[PDB]
């Protein structure tokens, strides 16, 4: 009750104001515990009120931050495993056999523990969402091999940590400037013993003829295939497409949001320009237009695989994959 | 039997003339139906071959692919209806409740294809179309209800100025349209925003049968990055593989020098394809295929 | 002056109806040269503004980009005559027989062109044309007379039906010829070997201005792999820098809902340029400008 506002609250405030969990499979832990403590502690009857008391948490989180997208995507999985669960409990996708071949009203009583069980093995299954994909590093990296990144990705790092524990190669991390966490991410990869160069992303074509394979992370990944991935990397996306260079994207099945690209001016997230130009400048401020796009749009044609825990696919496959976690209901949520 | 081919044709030709706005895949399968409901017949076998000897001469009346992708639809909602039931006047009764349900539910896919496109559509963006659509003119009428404000190029498609009537059923409800030439795609091209256009068919691969300047607009459109989307009904899913332009079956081509009246467009050229199923990429299209035929 | 606004007109819409196989732009430099032989003036600047007045009206006459092409090379010729002589007595002599021997070459120029670009026809090939234009029916007609057999795919060229008239040409002199729509050069593109279309005007990066459809149609080849040839003559070297579409001047566009005449195409999507100084690639004509102009 009281517990739960308090910290569906703080949740809010903290997306709001930014900080708060670092990593993303951190984020979707905490939807997943924040949901299932609003399953367990307030009160419902049958599946269409919590199915409504969902998608009004789910609208005031997404408000809050429309950016946080893995949010979102919890709250829609939840709604799925819901819908599935009372579909399975109570009976027994749009397609043309479904359109030839031909209420949530009903209360069962052992539903709300099926709902928390399945919440149960979601978030086991997150768990080792990190490691499952690292396992597939040796079949994508050979030897002296030339690997480009950019920015900071958690999944990439333990990609090239597990393939360097038999295989020599190089890797290239761009600084995704302002904040240049690409520097982390080459110490780190040079604390493992992996050769790195550090370098800005204005070089990104310029080394890109010597680079062998691209693999990038993602903030979200888009029903298309398109990504929404750190700023710059539209630009090294085109330089690989360029010189035909596989662009491999280590992102996890949860940072899958059922979206389409026609959203527009909320997309990218804009910070203070002090990021880009400083308050010491002076009075030239007064009269200059400065924007600071976190984000970027990456067309799904520029990409070549997507790995995640279940494995690797091409984007043209992403739609049957966004079709087994999120009903076509739940899209405008 | 009942309803010779000249009352199957007069059906036709009267729903076809009765409601312009329906489209003639419509016509065609509201025509088999009504066809299926009087037929007097007692067994699968006469009842598939008279429906299969009615498609042929309904595709004799109309050389457009959407007639025959209707009737192949039709054929195969027969055959699943069958399948479930094998008392011939059961599966009947099953087969008139799921055409009725069928018939009203495609009635209504153009307003969804709408709804699900006319965000695409940007304030102040530039739309190109090709030749004369309801399903373009619908979007754009949904576009135009959202108050958002946008100008319209359109093709005059010379074989029949159908660009013409576009133009002027967009002006109707006060949305600023200009007309080109056909030879004037590429010149235009740099000043749309994005390409909107219809499809006649929907083949295997994901790409479309259209009006003969689709191809020309499409590559155009890659040539310089544009999104090139195609509005299409479910009901123009065919089960065809063309190759080139040539190998289009030619009872499409022609009777509708050398004047082809249609053309194929790969699932490379187009971005996204908005239908009543929903936006999707071209490789969902093979997908529903497949699994309507098991 | 001498020679009237009214009376320059007249002499030039005589001396193009007169012999209608010469071109606009070799008109209008006979006209030129023809008001340089009966000026009755003593001083080049005099002459020179009133040849720009000429020219200027000329353009005014028709829109043609080769008729300003031809005004800008006559005022080349001129200036470089004044550097040669200073004295205008002995320069307007020297102007007159080297315009004379200048008109001469700019008429064998198109025969130079036919002979050095039939060779690039091949027996059974499928040539594809845009519209009506006389060095491609000249070069069409030296492959002939080569004892050679090809096809030709001609468009009809919407806004004035120029390809009706040029498929009348190639049947007067037995050639297998066909006729499609502005809409259906991509759909013909793959049955089409090769590409030949002229040029009103050959801008400083080496791409063409030319009928409104040519822009598209090398986009379609290109997309195909397939060669493009442009046969012109050098006297419609132009130093025109057109960015896009757009860029291209409006005085070239309209009067020769919207309609513009001509189009540009880029270098990138030329193969090769066929002129009477020879078969050049794009990067050639922008040398020869440069070396014109010192």
Redesign the interface.
């Known amino acids: 009750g009281s517990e739960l506002s308090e910290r569906i609250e703080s949740f809010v405030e903290t997306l709001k104001r930014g900080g708060g969990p670092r990593s993303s499979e951190e984020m979707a832990r905490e939807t997943l515990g924040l949901l299932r403590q609003i399953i367990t502690d307030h009160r419902w009857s049958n599946a269409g009120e919590l199915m409504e008391l969902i998608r009004r948490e789910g609208r005031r989180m997404t408000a809050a931050q429309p950016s946080e997208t893995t949010v979102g995507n919890m709250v829609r999985r939840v709604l799925k495993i819901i819908r599935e669960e009372y579909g399975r409990l109570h009976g027994r996708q749009?397609?043309?056999?479904k359109?030839?071949?031909?209420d949530f009203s009903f209360h069962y009583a052992q539903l709300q523990s099926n709902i928390i069980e399945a919440i149960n093995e979601l978030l086991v299954e997150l768990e080792g969402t990190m490691e499952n994909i690292a396992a597939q590093a040796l079949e994508h990296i050979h030897s002296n091999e030339v690997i480009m990144t950019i920015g900071f990705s958690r999944t990439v790092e333990a990609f090239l940590k597990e393939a360097a524990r038999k295989r020599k190669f190089h890797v290239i991390v761009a600084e995704c400037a302002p904040f240049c966490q690409g520097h982390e991410m080459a110490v780190n990869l040079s604390k493992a013993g992996i050769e790195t160069t550090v370098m800005t992303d204005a070089a990104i074509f310029a080394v890109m003829s010597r680079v062998n394979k691209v693999i990038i992370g993602t903030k979200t990944i888009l029903?298309?295939?398109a990504l929404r991935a750190v700023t710059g990397t539209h630009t090294l996306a085109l330089a690989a497409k360029h010189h035909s260079t596989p662009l491999i994207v280590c992102a996890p099945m949860f940072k899958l949001s059922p979206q389409?690209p026609?959203e527009?001016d909320s997309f990218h997230k804009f910070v203070a320009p002090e990021e880009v130009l400083p308050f010491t400048e002076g009075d030239i401020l007064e009269k200059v237009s400065v924007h600071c796009p976190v984000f970027d749009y990456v067309p799904?044609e520029l990409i070549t695989l997507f790995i995640s825990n279940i494995g690797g696919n091409a984007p043209?496959?992403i739609?049957?994959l966004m079709s087994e976690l999120y009903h076509?209901d739940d899209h405008v949520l | 039997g009942p309803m010779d081919d000249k009352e199957l044709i007069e059906y036709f030709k009267s729903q076809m003339k009765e409601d312009p706005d329906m489209a003639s895949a419509v016509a065609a399968i509201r025509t088999l139906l009504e066809f299926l409901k009087r037929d007097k017949g007692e067994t699968i076998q006469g009842l598939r071959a008279n429906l299969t000897s009615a498609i042929e001469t309904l595709c004799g009346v109309d050389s457009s692919v959407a007639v025959s992708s209707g009737g192949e639809?039709f054929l195969?909602?027969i055959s699943?209806?069958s399948l479930?039931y094998s008392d011939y006047s059961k599966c009947k009764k099953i087969m008139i409740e799921?055409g009725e349900?069928?018939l009203r539910?495609?009635s209504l896919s153009r307003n969804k294809i709408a709804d699900l496109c006319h965000?695409?559509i940007?304030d102040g963006a530039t739309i190109l179309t090709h030749a004369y659509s309801r399903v373009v003119l619908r979007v754009l009428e949904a576009a135009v209800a959202a108050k958002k404000r946008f100008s319209v190029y359109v093709t005059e498609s010379q074989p029949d100025l159908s660009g013409k009537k576009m133009a002027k059923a967009l002006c109707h409800l006060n949305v600023p349209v200009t007309v080109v030439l056909d030879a004037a795609v590429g010149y235009i091209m740099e000043k749309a925003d994005l390409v909107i256009v219809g499809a006649e068919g929907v083949v295997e691969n994901g790409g479309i049968i259209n009006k003969i300047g689709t191809n020309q607009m499409a590559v155009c459109a890659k040539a310089q990055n544009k999104p090139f989307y195609v509005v299409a009904e479910?009901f123009k899913?065919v089960r065809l593989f063309p190759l080139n332009q040539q190998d289009v079956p030619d009872k499409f081509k022609y009777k509708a020098e050398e004047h082809p009246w249609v053309d194929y467009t790969a699932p490379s050229l187009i971005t996204?394809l908005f239908t009543?199923?929903?936006?999707?990429?071209?490789?969902?299209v093979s997908?529903?295929?497949i699994?309507?035929y098991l």
Do not use: M
């Open positions: 749009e397609s043309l056999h359109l030839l071949t031909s029903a298309n295939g389409f026609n527009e799904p043209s496959y739609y049957r076509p | 639809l195969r909602f699943l209806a479930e799921r349900l069928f539910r495609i965000t695409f940007k479910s899913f996204l009543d199923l929903g936006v999707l990429t071209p490789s969902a997908d529903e295929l699994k309507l």
